[PDB]
Design a protein around this ligand. Structure first.
Ligand code: ZN
Ligand code: ZN
Length: 53
């Protein structure tokens, strides 16, 4: 409840949790745990990774 990454558990502070929330997990993810998705958004390393289902 302090705004910490959901992959590395790091302080978000000046991260902006308004849009820094994986659209596939709904959790927080710093600008280092996000993978530029070919689409018009981004998905954590756990989502953008190579895996389905
Ligand atoms: Zn995710
Ligand atoms: Zn992170």
């Amino acid at each position: 409840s302090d705004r910490t990454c959901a992959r590395c558990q790091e302080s978000l502070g000046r991260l902006s949790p308004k849009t820094n929330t994986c659209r596939g997990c709904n959790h927080l993810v710093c600008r280092d745990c996000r993978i530029q998705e070919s689409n018009g958004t981004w998905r954590c390393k756990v989502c953008a990774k190579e895996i389905e289902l």
